[PDB]
Symmetry: C6
Subunit: 64 residues, 6 copies
């Protein structure tokens, strides 16, 4: 899988990301944690984001 390495880096370097949902809605923050079903995104509070409703995950700066 490539998801695990990719999300690991955003989580590890605490890189600010834009997650865009399948309806265009745009969420912003830092990936607190993830599992195969969900991604937890942190701003004021931790929200649970369902991967099945995610279209793309967009880092806000280049990530090694």
């Amino acid at each position: 899988s490539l998801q695990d390495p990719f999300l690991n880096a955003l989580r590890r370097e605490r890189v600010p990301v834009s997650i865009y949902l399948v309806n265009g809605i745009k969420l912003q923050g830092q990936i607190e944690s993830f599992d195969q079903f969900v991604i937890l995104l942190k701003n004021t509070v931790s929200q649970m984001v369902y991967k099945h409703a995610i279209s793309t995950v967009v880092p806000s700066r280049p990530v090694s």
Copy 2:
């Protein structure tokens, strides 16, 4: 899984949440119970929310 621990806390502390559906529609209330397929949300009546139609689950205050 992380869903189970996360939804357990909202259910246990009866934390008011905003569930946003895959079409932007915004539901509000308290998680009465959940299973892998569905989430029951309580306001005036208990409604059955299908997880596959959920985009994100947003607590209304920080949850341990």
Copy 3:
């Protein structure tokens, strides 16, 4: 599962429900029968509702 107990009660007490589809469209009537894939809803005619296109199931009065 919780779906089976929940839909059983709406079907058994013939409780009028609003099923809202993943596109916001709102259907109304009584649950005639269900299986894991579909829900049959009755008004003038019986229509077949695919669960995968259901977002939430909303009873029109409290159900034990």
Copy 4:
């Protein structure tokens, strides 16, 4: 399953149906045949309808 009995009757009595897709779009005609994945609907030509994109199947008259 209930789908098989339900779609069998529409196909067998050649009952005119409205299939509404997950985007609201409304298709009309008669069910030529079906399998678990798809439904063939007939008007001027036979079109292939993917069940995963179907929200509900609405007969145009009561069906035994």
Copy 5:
């Protein structure tokens, strides 16, 4: 399955089709090839169409 026979005929007789995506968007051309996940459609270039995002496949003339 019925998909395989149906798509085989459109591909074999090089029948011009309209594929309508789950968002209403309408694509046109000829089916170059298919597998269970995807359909390749040809116009100026070959594009890869994901079946999960297809609502219906509409031939532009009757197909045996």
Copy 6:
């Protein structure tokens, strides 16, 4: 499968593609890498695109 050969060619010849998401949104760039779940697309930064939210993959020039 046909996806693997098709995406391999876009990735190998570094062919500029338009990926259109299930909500019409149009993304552009080059396929950096892929796995069965996701496609990484490169412009200014590498973004993670979920295949389940992809409708079609459109090369910007004929690809052998």
